[PDB]
Design a protein around this ligand. Sequence first.
Ligand code: X6G
Length: 271
Amino acid sequence: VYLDRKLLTLEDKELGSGNFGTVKKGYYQMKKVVKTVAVKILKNEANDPALKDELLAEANVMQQLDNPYIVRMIGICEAESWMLVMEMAELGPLNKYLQQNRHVKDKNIIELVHQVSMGMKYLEESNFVHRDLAARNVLLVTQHYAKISDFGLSKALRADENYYKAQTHPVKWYAPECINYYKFSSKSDVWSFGVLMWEAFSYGQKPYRGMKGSEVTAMLEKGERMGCPAGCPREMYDLMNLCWTYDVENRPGFAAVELRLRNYYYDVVNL
Ligand SMILES: Cc1cc(C)cc(Nc2nccc(-n3cc(CN4CC(O)C4)c(C)n3)n2)c1
């Protein structure tokens, strides 16, 4: 679990950047083979151990998760910086990939979001809230194999509550109960999966283009939702709207969302 920096080699170039630091391709020498890895490296000119604790929390969540459609942690490494080492998904973020591969078919995108729904079904069963479910945090192992990434904001739910109460705030992916009451549940992940599906079938376009968060909030408060993406199957658009049910209780969970994705995939495969 605590990895050896000497057995790890990092690429000089970055896969992607952010607030924390960098994400880099690496190779980690395992039993007698090497494993290609992606490594989240924390920038600390200064120690600010606060950020450090966030990385170990992110690791602490991944540690407990075991599913084919969730990114696997190899472990963490304390070296010239703090590092979270993960199994490499070579093709990278779904949104960027679909931007650059418009030739990809409906059926393929349905397969991809269905795999995400399966990964989220597991997360729901395990009582973890993702809290950041978007197309940028779906990574492709192949064109036909997707994995959910980025657990920096995830929370293990309490055994007596089905939700997590946050502090002050991503708005475009948040269900209304998150905006108004700061309440995060598997149902708010379901709302977010709706936005993610909209992203997928728009080939990586941004949701609610050119709108401030308060305008998005206001639009949703008056019963309005994003329009159908050009070319999107009707059944997937219908599913998006069901995911954007205002009322938390009547909004479906991932079990029901997954099932409705199975059936339509097989329908598209058998049409
Ligand atoms: C070609 C390419 C580019 C990029 C940016 C990522 C990969 N794939 C890969 N694989 C395993 C883990 C990660 N992780 C990437 C991250 C950073 N996330 C990508 C979300 O956009 C932020 C994390 C926590 N794990 N990423 C592949």
